[PDB]
Structure 1
Amino acid sequence: GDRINTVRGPITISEAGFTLTHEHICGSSAGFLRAWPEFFGSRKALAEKAVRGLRRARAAGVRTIVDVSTFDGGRDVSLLAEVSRAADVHIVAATGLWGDPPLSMRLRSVEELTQFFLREIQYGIEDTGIRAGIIKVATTGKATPFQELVLKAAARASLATGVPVTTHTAASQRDGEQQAAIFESEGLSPSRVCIGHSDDTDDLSYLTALAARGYLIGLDHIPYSAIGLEDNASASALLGIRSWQTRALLIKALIDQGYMKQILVSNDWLFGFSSYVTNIMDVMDRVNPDGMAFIPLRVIPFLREKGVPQETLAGITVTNPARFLSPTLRA
């Protein structure tokens, strides 16, 4: 662990700089962007949109994003490579499986899924030689028998390579506790694991208990809010009705409890989003015109106004991501 894999190759830990640890270029399904690009206008329109976004996030000080799109969330690593190069923003690619595995994945054993995740980390994604730098996994409430396999394989791959694991939860159902249990059953260090979408709970003790055990806490979808458009059931279900300030104040909460070193922050933004209702992207872009810049432009200043030391903010946005992304084998 002296280098972090990106879609442009390895970078040093110090090169990562300000890092958004949970983002997407395009939330889709495997093959979908290749087969139906006109769903996004065109592939070129999507790329141009991504580059404009990335460039504006760069302007606000973002140096690196971690794209946590998996194979079943439509990751297209050649698009990532293209936009990373055009925008001059580092991108870290993911392996793992998210909430929508097709049959060829759902039927696999824990050993098979381990070999798959290892392939994407060690050999590269598809025929690109681009090596994943993180492993994304998911539950939404109690794990399905298959999701149990996925978590165990992610733990096995992370123990082998040192690359971290980062998760989708339903935070209101306290999924992080079962995920931690399964990870620890495989002997994974909690410091290898980010329990994501954790900004969906106001249950502060659920977060503090996990932080105290060494887990990273992903407060990773701060701009998500349907305040102002709650008639729209599909957007409400996705964005929630808690304000961005509510989400952002959990960062301050965990800091105030002594866990500044356990916090990772992100927007969870995307430039295309086919795996939900049509035009959800337009709805989201009107909610948060800053897009991926929302963290530096809105959240960091808000927290400083609320008294959080800038140096603590820097620890959260630079140190924590570098420590987490640094591949780290156990002793």
Structure 2
Amino acid sequence: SIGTGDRINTVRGPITISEAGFTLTHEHICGSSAGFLRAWPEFFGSRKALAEKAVRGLRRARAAGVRTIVDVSTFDIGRDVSLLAEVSRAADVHIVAATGLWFDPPLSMRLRSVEELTQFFLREIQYGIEDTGIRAGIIKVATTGKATPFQELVLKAAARASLATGVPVTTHTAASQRDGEQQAAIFESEGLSPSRVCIGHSDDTDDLSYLTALAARGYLIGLDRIPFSAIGLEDNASASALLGIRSWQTRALLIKALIDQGYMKQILVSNDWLFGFSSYVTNIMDVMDRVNPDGMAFIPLRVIPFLREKGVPQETLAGITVTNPARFLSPTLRAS
């Protein structure tokens, strides 16, 4: 394999691999829908209030050592690159933007062909998002169980955009249903190297056999929902469905498990947090903020020390939070 320039695109421009530092690979400034933030900002109180909450949150994460976050918000998750650039500059935290499609694509997207979708992803990566010139540094895709026909087209287009640019692919999965396996099958059918792929939401499942099997093939495993837990919220149907009833310690231990299995170079950790959330029931953000007041600082403030306490070498934790993200994000073209 070869590189493209040894630089990673952020909403403030390109940065060197060394500048990325401690990186949270799966985060959101706002979980919404295309055009929603600009059409109904009052849903989040106001755009200004959302930005300020994001800035406060990112500063606290930065204080705990976080220097970069990857906002995996796609077009259909309502990604607003202007908001990202604004909060990034105010908080002095690098933010890598994404292209791709989540599981709520509109008609204008759902009817497109794989070639058309491939051009859209390439546009956002090479030309820039909208008319901002801000280039995406990662491709986001997803499935909720077996891939629908359209989702298959999306993953293929993601693989092609990836092979052409060197930008990695990260995914949302229904961990329990072992989605990672079908996703891997499609990606490989397109010639994409597993090292360019992160199977996300893997901590949503306790099946270590499924995880280690994917890791053995070269895929990066995303344990990105560590703080998700509805324990003590059994009475909240909606919160329970999204967060699950497994403790954050349970999720965190999968990190230690994979390390023991010898897959430390293939682990990526994150919170899957956000500061705004309109694509779900109202006030879910409030419920979430009560579950995890640390927000994005949860990983450095509670997960890292937890792992260290239970035997994981500090050096190994540095490798997972600094070295793996850097190697993953560095635009990398396959050997021709």
Q: Report TM bin, short chain.
A: over 0.9
> What's the Cα RMSD here?
0.3
Give the SS at the match of 2:141: strand
Return the alpha-carbon distance in structure 2 between the equivalents of residues 161 and 233 of structure 1.
42
Q: How far apart are the structure 1 equivalents of 2:198 and 2:234?
A: 30
Matched, 1:285 2:289: yes
Helix, strand or coil for the counterpart of 2:139? strand
Report how far residue 28 of structure 1 moved.
Answer: 0.3
Once the two structures are TM-superposed, the CA of residue 276 in structure 1 deviates from its matched residue by: 0.3
What secondary structure does 2:97 align onto? strand
4+ aligned runs moved over 2 Å, structure 1: none
1:118-139 CA-partner distances (Å, limit 9, x unpaired)? 0000000000000000000000
> Using the alignment, how far apart are the partners of 1:310 and 1:143 within structure 2?
39
Report Cα offsets for 1:205-234 as digits up to 9, x if no partner.
Answer: 100010000000000010000001111010
Task: Report the CA distance between 1:64 and its aligned residue.
Answer: 0.0
SS of alignment partner, residue 72 of structure 1: helix
C-alpha distance in structure 1 between counterparts of 2:170 and 2:22, whole Å: 18
- Deviation per CA, 1:216-275, whole angstroms, max 9, x where unpaired? 000001000000111101000000000000000000000000000000000000000000
- Identity of counterpart residues, as a percentage? 99
| Alignment length (residue pairs) | 331
Separation of aligned partners in 2, 1:203 and 1:268? 20
Deviations 1:139-191 (A, max 9, x none): 01000000000000000000000000000000000000000000000000000
- 1:95 matched to 2:99? The reply is yes
Counterpart Cα distance in 2 of 1:201 and 1:290: 23
SS in structure 2 of the partner of residue 84 of structure 1 = helix
Structure 1 residues 84-116: Cα deviation after superposition (integer angstroms, max 9, x where no partner): 000000000000000100000000000000000
SS, match of residue 268 in structure 2: strand
Aligned residue among 105, 108, 111 for 1:104: 108
Verify: 1:248 aligned to 2:252, yes or no.
Answer: yes
In 1, distance between residues paired with 2:287 and 2:96?
Answer: 27
Q: Which segments of 5 or more consecutive residues in structure 1 lack a partner in the other structure?
A: none
After superposition, give the CA deviation of every residue in 1:286-321 in whole Å (9 maximum; x if it has no partner): 000000000000000000000000100000000000
- What residue in structure 2 maps to residue 67 of structure 1? 71
Structure 1 CA distance for aligned equivalents of residues 203 and 125 of structure 2: 28
Counterparts of 2:243 and 2:96 in 1: how far apart (Å)? Answer: 25
Alpha-carbon separation, structure 1, partners of 2:319 and 2:209: 23
Distance (Å, rounded) in 2 between the aligned partners of 1:124 and 1:185 = 28
TM-score (norm 1): 1.00
**In 2, distance between residues paired with 1:237 and 1:68?**
21
1:313 aligns with 2:317: yes
Structure 1: how far apart are the matches of 2:232 and 2:96?
34
The SS at the match of 1:29 is: coil
Alpha-carbon distance in structure 2 between the residues aligned to 1:212 and 1:326? 22
Indicate the SS of the match to 1:135: strand
